Amino acid sequence: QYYREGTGSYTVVLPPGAKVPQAEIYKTSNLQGAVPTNSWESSILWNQYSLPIYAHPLTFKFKAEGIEVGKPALGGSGIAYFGAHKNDFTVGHSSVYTFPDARADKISDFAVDAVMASGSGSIKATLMKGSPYAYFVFTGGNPRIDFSGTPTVFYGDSGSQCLGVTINGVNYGLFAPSGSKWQGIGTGTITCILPAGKNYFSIAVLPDNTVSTLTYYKDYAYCFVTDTKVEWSYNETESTLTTTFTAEVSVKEGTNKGTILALYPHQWRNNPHILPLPYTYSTLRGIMKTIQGTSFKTVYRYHGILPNLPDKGTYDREALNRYINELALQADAPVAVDTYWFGKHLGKLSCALPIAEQLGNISAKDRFISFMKSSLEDWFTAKEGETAKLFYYDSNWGTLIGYPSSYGSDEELNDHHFHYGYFLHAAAQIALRDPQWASRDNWGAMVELLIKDIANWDRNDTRFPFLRNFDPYEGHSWASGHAGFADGNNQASSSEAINAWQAIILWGEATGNKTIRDLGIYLYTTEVEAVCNYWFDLYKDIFSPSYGHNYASMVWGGKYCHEIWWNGTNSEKHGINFLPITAASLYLGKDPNYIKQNYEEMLRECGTSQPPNWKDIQYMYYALYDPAAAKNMWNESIVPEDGESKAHTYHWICNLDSLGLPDFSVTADTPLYSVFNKNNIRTYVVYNASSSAKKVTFSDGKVMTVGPHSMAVSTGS
Ligand SMILES: [Ca+2]
Ligand SMILES: [Ca+2]
Ligand SMILES: [Ca+2]
Ligand SMILES: [Cl-]
Ligand SMILES: [Cl-]
Ligand SMILES: [Cl-]
Ligand SMILES: [Cl-]
Ligand SMILES: [Mg+2]
Ligand SMILES: [Mg+2]
Ligand SMILES: [Mg+2]
Ligand SMILES: [Mg+2]
Ligand code: NA
Ligand code: NA
Ligand code: NI
Ligand code: NI
């Protein structure tokens, strides 16, 4: 049947030939509502056991015997750097040597509980991103710790409560209940003889082999993490985005209450709200610092986005208008009609629409808006017997899938944020112009279902899991639905994730929905912060000296590398983390010197003096360092990348030529703004999406009054 949402609808009738994710979900009866996907723990759900689980600092893998535990040995040189999962020891069971599967029982914002059970025993494991601990509860027998070789025992004996061990050069604590004994010390398998009535057991990866360190880790070893939560707040007055991270602990014994949290660089860098412990871990993501506590916060400065750049460029206006007319002839001509390529086309129209309006090209404006609306209205309606341009709800997993699908959006739940971000961008641009169309009673209900599929914010709405594609702790998104790879989950295009997030900001502000807007600000701001570290390494302290590049195109749980999914040029390899370039893409230019370094690396790698291909994308990027040079190199012979247009490319470059480069040293008390700086002259741009005039104040003292539903630009003091 069919479910009405405002004036649109989705279906639960699968079109003929259409494919869905697998029927089998390796979950327990405790995991209710829509099933989380697109994360680091996801392979537990899709595979009988799991693929490697990249929590950090620890990694894991489920198998018939139990749970492999390890700390990756970092290495590699050149095109990739590796932190592969390896087995330092397997947490097995004294009487159950073969478990039939591993099933997810509970998934929180940065942890997972999984259960392995036979009729005669079980292990329940809690794996946590940002913890040096892993926590276990046994039934039917004892922990049987099967080491990869024989460990060195640096502390403890058969009668001690804990052991300090070293295996593969990695120090661990093994923490048993008071009253436990240990059998098999000196062999490759140590069994923890649990006392009657106590069945909890934990391990930690330690930063050293001192007894003092082991004592500190023992102090918190019995504070088992039972829930993890993020919360966020956008402060409009201060232009900041605050995120709180909270772990709930259940104290299994002792009088200590707390835990040790490990923080990635995007969390600890320049963070005045923490007092790190001495302990660090060297990980694939850089140095993880540690803190004592069950909560911490991060606070980032938000620098605004715009719905478009203003009409301030040094372009030949008649040529720009002609480019708009050239695009208008192709307004109804997507290169392909699956969700992804249809999206790319909708993004192209979304970026050209305001340029047509600025020029007074009503014919082209009308062609663009008409196609955007008619196509969204088609996609957002599932007609009986329709096989293309519709959304289907899978109620096994709990996901909205558009048909026709592509690149595993259907069977693998890949990439929904990438695909749907383009649809959301188009919807937002319509909403800024037409509050009637975007209302919940009209097309806004279906729009918000796409938002919920990729980024549901409401933990009580069980139709979609909480924040599907975004990983709150790594601070970025994940592309694979299942993470069914040795190297875990992956994301290549961070810029396509950010496109979805900027679109959510615009939608929320256009519709007056502060919850959705602030969700967008949270996602956007945090992903940008992660991107600046793990993709661009702006601070020059993430990437190994042995890694041969200043840029990683793909980030995995277990590696990062300068590769892409097809045999493209090095221009393509760099460009996938720029496109789509929108008026939310100024973050790419946080460090103009990095723009220069990144572009020059790309040229060296191509063996050319200009980009061999994707020259439009590359010159838009280079314009964040030298717009005059980018304008000079640009020309009409360039065949646009399929999601781009000559009009939008040249409007971008020529506006930066006039306005200057983005200036991140100034903020404002409004959500839609940007500041530009040309040779120390600032230009301030604001968009007011509300129905009342706004007074906008910048941190340097600039004040602008901006009328309802308008863009304003002011240069100088
Ligand atoms: Ca339809
Ligand atoms: Ca149709
Ligand atoms: Ca997620
Ligand atoms: Cl002890
Ligand atoms: Cl106690
Ligand atoms: Cl004309
Ligand atoms: Cl339809
Ligand atoms: Mg499984
Ligand atoms: Mg062994
Ligand atoms: Mg360095
Ligand atoms: Mg030129
Ligand atoms: Na190349
Ligand atoms: Na074009
Ligand atoms: Ni490169
Ligand atoms: Ni030309």
Q: Which residues make up the environment of ion ligand 4, defined by Cβ < 5 Å?
A: 160-162
Distance 217 CA to ligand 9 centre (A): 24
Distance 269 CA to ligand 13 centre (A): 41
Residues contacting residue 474 through CB under 8 Å, at least 6 positions apart: 40, 129, 264, 285, 530
- Give the span between the Cα atoms of 349 and 328, in whole angstroms: 9
Nearest alpha carbon to residue 536 among 555, 515, 519, 523: 555
Distance 39 CA to ligand 10 centre (A): 28
Per-position DSSP letters for 370-422, written without gaps between them: HHHHHHHHHHT---TT--SSEEEEETTTTEEEEES--TTTTTS---HHHHHHH
Among the bound ligands, the one closest to the CA of 542: 10
Query: Buried (b) or exposed (e) across 461-496, using 16+ Cβ within 10 A?
Result: eebbbbbbbbbbbbbbbbbbbbbebebbbbbbbbbb
Residues contacting residue 130 through CB under 8 Å, at least 6 positions apart: 55, 56, 110, 245, 261, 262, 263, 264, 288, 473
- Give the span between the Cα atoms of 269 and 468, in whole angstroms: 26
Per-position DSSP letters for 304-321, written without gaps between them: -B-SS--S---S-HHHHH
Q: Are 477 and 471 in contact (CB under 8 A)?
A: yes
Q: How many CA atoms lie within 13 A of 299 on its CB side?
A: 8
Q: 3-state DSSP call for residue 266?
A: helix
Q: Are 641 and 616 in contact (CB under 8 A)?
A: yes
Among the bound ligands, the one closest to the CA of 64: 8
Q: Which residues make up the environment of ion ligand 10, defined by Cβ < 5 Å?
A: 540
- Classify burial at 373, counting beta carbons within 10 Å of its beta carbon; exposed 0-12, middle 13-18, buried 19 or more: middle
Distance 693 CA to ligand 10 centre (A): 47
Q: Are 349 and 373 in contact (CB under 8 A)?
A: no
Distance 383 CA to ligand 1 centre (A): 6
For tokens 């040790």, the residue is 260
For tokens 């479910």, the residue is 3
- Whether the link from the prior residue into 143 is cis, omega within 30° of 0, is no
Nearest alpha carbon to residue 557 among 60, 126, 102: 60
Q: Are 550 and 597 in contact (CB under 8 A)?
A: yes
Two tokens, residue 524: 């956007």
Nearest alpha carbon to residue 703 among 689, 692, 716, 691: 716
Distance 497 CA to ligand 2 centre (A): 27
Two tokens, residue 585: 């893409």
Among the bound ligands, the one closest to the CA of 631: 11
- Classify burial at 541, counting beta carbons within 10 Å of its beta carbon; exposed 0-12, middle 13-18, buried 19 or more: exposed
Fold of 2-227: Beta-galactosidase; Chain A, domain 5 (2.70.98)
Q: Which residues pair with 455 in a beta bridge?
A: none
Distance 161 CA to ligand 4 centre (A): 4
State how far the alpha carbon of 178 is from the alpha carbons of 125, 182, 200, 222, 251, in Å: 20, 12, 10, 10, 13
Distance 572 CA to ligand 14 centre (A): 10
Residues contacting residue 202 through CB under 8 Å, at least 6 positions apart: 133, 134, 135, 136, 175, 221, 222, 224
- Give the span between the Cα atoms of 489 and 500, in whole angstroms: 19
Distance 67 CA to ligand 9 centre (A): 13
Distance 386 CA to ligand 7 centre (A): 7
Nearest alpha carbon to residue 535 among 562, 567, 517: 562
Nearest alpha carbon to residue 449 among 516, 375, 357: 516
Distance 378 CA to ligand 1 centre (A): 4
Q: Are 660 and 681 in contact (CB under 8 A)?
A: yes
Among the bound ligands, the one closest to the CA of 125: 8
Distance 339 CA to ligand 13 centre (A): 21
What element of type H or E holds 60? Answer: strand 59-63
Among the bound ligands, the one closest to the CA of 221: 4
**Alpha carbon 223 to its chain's center:** 29
**Alpha carbon 448 to its chain's center:** 19
Distance 378 CA to ligand 2 centre (A): 5
Which is it for the CA torsion 541, 128, 261, 302, positive or negative? positive
Distance 412 CA to ligand 3 centre (A): 15
Among the bound ligands, the one closest to the CA of 364: 6
Q: Which residues make up the environment of ion ligand 3, defined by Cβ < 5 Å?
A: 39, 467
- Give the span between the Cα atoms of 414 and 419, in whole angstroms: 9
Reading phi first (left if > 0) and then psi (alpha if -120 to 50, else beta), residue 117 is in beta
Query: Most distant CA pair in the chain: distance in Å?
Result: 86
Q: 3-state DSSP call for residue 9?
A: strand
Two tokens, residue 360: 């007074």
**How do beta strands 181-183 and 223-235 pair?**
unpaired
Distance 19 CA to ligand 2 centre (A): 19
Distance 138 CA to ligand 4 centre (A): 20
**How do beta strands 710-715 and 2-5 pair?**
unpaired
276 C-beta neighbours (distance < 10 Å), count:
13
Q: Are 675 and 716 in contact (CB under 8 A)?
A: no
- Give the span between the Cα atoms of 160 and 153, in whole angstroms: 12
Give the method used: X-ray
Nearest alpha carbon to residue 350 among 321, 372, 367: 372
- Give the span between the Cα atoms of 677 and 665, in whole angstroms: 10
Among the bound ligands, the one closest to the CA of 15: 1
Q: Give, rounded to a whole angstrom, the gap between the first and last alpha carbons of the chain.
A: 61
- Give the span between the Cα atoms of 191 and 194, in whole angstroms: 9
Among the bound ligands, the one closest to the CA of 188: 9
Q: Which residues make up the environment of ion ligand 13, defined by Cβ < 5 Å?
A: 327, 640, 645-646
Distance 651 CA to ligand 13 centre (A): 12
Two tokens, residue 90: 């397997």
